[PDB]
């Protein structure tokens, strides 16, 4: 048996392994200490158990659920399609998109852990406490998730 | 506002999208007889029912789309579940594996199951050994309402 936190990290890694080489855009915000309820209220309610397969199905392009942010709360997908604050992007390379602006903006006003798969490049990135970590390998991505979510 | 009313609205809207697009769908609704043996074969979601989620689940060539969705107590309990296929012999070529699963489940349970054919977009329902096929959208909604409400 393995924890819900462990299962959730495994699901994130597997979903990103699928989405990145396919350049499927994804935006997943994980609530930590600071409540994300104000943003959850803007999404489509799922209140679903997390699996790699559901995360992939959510982000498949041109589906009712793929635009906007998935928000995770207490090891459940509370909503999809939530609206996150967008950071100002003066001077930012053209390669980054609205998903990166939403992840950075959320990290500037909360302690949430947010990750992005770029629709433009398939790049993997994470925001946390105002820091932007981009062009991660899958293994570096997993290491960041574990360091933050399992700070053992 | 009832859970049953909300669930029926979501079924109807999901089928309004899938039927003209010939998107195959297989949704089994637990009634009195428990479907736990089949739920155990699927991918756990335990999710609120919405038309948006039902549509997203069944999009072709996606991880969740193969197999049956099973509804339990007005949640999506699982997707991708295996149902028993009927051995009823006389079933036309028009009907495929989703239909045989719906028929097979109705033979051994009081579940209400509906199917959208991936070959024709046709809508059908199985319930208590009966097979109602080629329903119009309005006939489909009427059956759901008669059986579930």
Residue numbers in the entry:
A (entry chain B): 85 to 236
B (entry chain A): 86 to 234
What did the published study say regarding this structure?
The enzyme CdaA, which synthesizes an essential second messenger cyclic di-AMP (c-di-AMP) in many pathogenic bacteria, has emerged as a promising candidate for the development of novel antibiotics.
However, suitable crystallization conditions for unliganded LmCdaA could not be identified. Therefore, structurally related CdaA enzymes from S. pneumoniae, B. subtilis and E. faecium were cloned, overexpressed in E. coli, purified, crystallized and evaluated for diffraction quality. Additionally, we report the first crystal structures of apo CdaA from E. faecium (EfCdaA) and S. pneumoniae (SpCdaA), as well as atomic resolution structures of BsCdaA.
